[PDB]
Design a protein around this ligand. Sequence first.
Ligand SMILES: *[C@@H]1O[C@H](CO[C@@H]2O[C@@H](C)[C@@H](O)[C@@H](O)[C@@H]2O)[C@@H](O[C@@H]2O[C@H](CO)[C@@H](O[C@@H]3O[C@H](CO[C@H]4O[C@H](CO)[C@@H](O)[C@H](O)[C@@H]4O[C@@H]4O[C@H](CO)[C@@H](O[C@@H]5O[C@H](CO)[C@H](O)[C@H](O)[C@H]5O)[C@H](O)[C@H]4NC(C)=O)[C@@H](O)[C@H](O[C@H]4O[C@H](CO)[C@@H](O)[C@H](O)[C@@H]4O)[C@@H]3O)[C@H](O)[C@H]2NC(C)=O)[C@H](O)[C@H]1NC(C)=O
Ligand SMILES: *[C@@H]1O[C@H](CO[C@@H]2O[C@@H](C)[C@@H](O)[C@@H](O)[C@@H]2O)[C@@H](O[C@@H]2O[C@H](CO)[C@@H](O[C@@H]3O[C@H](CO[C@H]4O[C@H](CO)[C@@H](O)[C@H](O)[C@@H]4O[C@@H]4O[C@H](CO)[C@@H](O[C@@H]5O[C@H](CO)[C@H](O)[C@H](O)[C@H]5O)[C@H](O)[C@H]4NC(C)=O)[C@@H](O)[C@H](O[C@H]4O[C@H](CO)[C@@H](O)[C@H](O)[C@@H]4O)[C@@H]3O)[C@H](O)[C@H]2NC(C)=O)[C@H](O)[C@H]1NC(C)=O
Lengths: 13, 208, 207
Amino acid sequence: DCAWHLGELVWCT
Amino acid sequence: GPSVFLFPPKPKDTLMISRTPEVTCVVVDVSHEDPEVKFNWYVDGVEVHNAKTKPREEQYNSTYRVVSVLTVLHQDWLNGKEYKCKVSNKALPAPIEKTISKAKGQPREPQVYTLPPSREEMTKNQVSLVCLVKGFYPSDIAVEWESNGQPENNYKTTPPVLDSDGSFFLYSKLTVDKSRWQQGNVFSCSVMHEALHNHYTQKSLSLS
Amino acid sequence: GPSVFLFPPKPKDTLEASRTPEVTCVVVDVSHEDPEVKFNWYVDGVEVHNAKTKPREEQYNSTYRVVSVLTVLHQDWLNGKEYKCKVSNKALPAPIEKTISKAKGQPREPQVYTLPPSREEMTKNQVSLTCLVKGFYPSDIAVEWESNGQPENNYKTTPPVLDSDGSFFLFSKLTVDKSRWQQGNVFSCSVMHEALHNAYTQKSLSL
Ligand SMILES: *[C@@H]1O[C@H](CO[C@@H]2O[C@@H](C)[C@@H](O)[C@@H](O)[C@@H]2O)[C@@H](O[C@@H]2O[C@H](CO)[C@@H](O[C@@H]3O[C@H](CO[C@H]4O[C@H](CO)[C@@H](O)[C@H](O)[C@@H]4O[C@@H]4O[C@H](CO)[C@@H](O[C@@H]5O[C@H](CO)[C@H](O)[C@H](O)[C@H]5O)[C@H](O)[C@H]4NC(C)=O)[C@@H](O)[C@H](O[C@H]4O[C@H](CO)[C@@H](O)[C@H](O)[C@@H]4O)[C@@H]3O)[C@H](O)[C@H]2NC(C)=O)[C@H](O)[C@H]1NC(C)=O
Ligand SMILES: *[C@@H]1O[C@H](CO[C@@H]2O[C@@H](C)[C@@H](O)[C@@H](O)[C@@H]2O)[C@@H](O[C@@H]2O[C@H](CO)[C@@H](O[C@@H]3O[C@H](CO[C@H]4O[C@H](CO)[C@@H](O)[C@H](O)[C@@H]4O[C@@H]4O[C@H](CO)[C@@H](O[C@@H]5O[C@H](CO)[C@H](O)[C@H](O)[C@H]5O)[C@H](O)[C@H]4NC(C)=O)[C@@H](O)[C@H](O[C@H]4O[C@H](CO)[C@@H](O)[C@H](O)[C@@H]4O)[C@@H]3O)[C@H](O)[C@H]2NC(C)=O)[C@H](O)[C@H]1NC(C)=O
């Protein structure tokens, strides 16, 4: 999965 | 004589894959007569060659500020690799060396809890929504607030405090107009830390 | 030569009618060859003579630490009186003057709100009780916890933070075993600040 912050990519495992 | 100051990346840059983390060797008190500075850079003792020198900046006290910037990989920094800057200059009888890295110590996942305003705060014009972040190590962290896809900027966050179990905690407080809270609006606490799943968690908060 | 540091009284000391506040003039880097320091205290420019000198202390880096302590009245400090220490020594081209006082500006009364543990925290061994202290000026403050007339030690308090309206806020976090919380015990956050009624308030929290 992936996390985003205000539309911007944070990280994906 | 010249002096050297070495600064880590910004936590956020190390934590957001879509950003560019960099360590920064700042050399002050560079004399007009010998402005030439040599930089040697080492990652865990092994010299790297990809640093870039920022434009020279003249200081109103008749000295120069010279800066070399080294870009780094997210994982190298977060793996705790040691970065060394070495500064040589003619006004410097011996080269000055400085080292930084991430704080050594088992990383620990922050636990993030949101807390609604006191029933006693309900009389006031504005209310405090609180985000408690505890049990995190190292102390490198980003805390932000938002509602409906937009950043809420009217918050303040405490510095990290060392807790008696060796980890850290902080609080972040966002202040909203009482009406905005009454109006059913959902508010979110965004925390970024190396030891979270995908370096990111979010906790939401609304009137019940 | 010597270097001088002047320290304010402790906030709790200024705030409790029973305790004794003091201003403290520390002089470091005093040499062996000339250990003699002259102190001159002034209070809003008016010289006072009741200060007392601490025992001289060897530092083992070739220097003495020399301390002069001046007692101050609670009202005087709070009313913002300025305190001056003039240090003279044969290794100073000229006497060093330092000055301290309470932070200037309208004092403001803190609002104290206690916040229970989050539902999500309820499956942990221990829980966090929160005391939000907000809207105080100046930043001089003391925070503590108690339960059933006994002191509760297991807490941490953040430093004061400057808020968007130019007052300060802090949080204090008391950690207790989950059991003690669920069993209905009352815990209290106690706050001492100049702008509170009787320089003191207490707020309680319980399931
Ligand atoms: C001649 O003048 C120069 C320049 O003077 C400046 O201009 C004049 C007009 C005055 O206003 C000065 O106040 C100005 O500084 C003098 O240079 C100064 O010398 C000081 C000592 O010699 C030195 O102090 C040390 O600073 C450390 C903190 O530095 C921070 O913060 C200060 C202020 O908050 C800031 O001025 C510095 O630039 C520096 O800022 C950081 O820069 C880094 C690198 O860019 C940033 O990190 C990067 O950020 C980018 C994006 O920006 C990106 O995110 C990257 O990922 C990241 O790497 C970082 O974010 C900046 N931080 C901030 C907050 O802005 C102190 O920590 C240090 O203390 C330590 O050492 C002491 C013991 O030696 C101890 O007391 C202490 O415990 C610490 O261990 C020092 O105090 C000043 O930095 C320096 N000023 C500048 C601009 O370099 C010069 O001294 C003078 N010479 C003479 C002969 O008179
Ligand atoms: C020889 O050694 C001495 C002693 O050093 C110690 O021993 C040696 C052998 C080593 O092991 C050291 O590690 C030891 O420290 C050296 O003396 C030091 O010199 C420094 C300056 O060169 C000086 O720095 C300044 O410190 C300020 C803070 O001082 C506090 O905090 C430190 C620790 O954080 C503490 O050690 C100090 O004693 C002092 O502590 C406070 O004392 C006051 C007075 O007692 C307390 O207040 C009173 O409390 C009582 C009850 O107890 C009562 O309530 C009264 O009402 C009340 O007044 C207070 O509670 C104590 N606080 C704390 C936290 O402990 C800094 O703020 C300051 O920085 C500022 O100024 C600079 C500008 O110049 C700026 O850079 C900066 O931004 C700030 O604005 C200074 O850095 C050290 O304090 C001093 N240490 C001592 C013990 O005196 C000496 O230098 C050395 N000489 C040589 C040639 O090597």
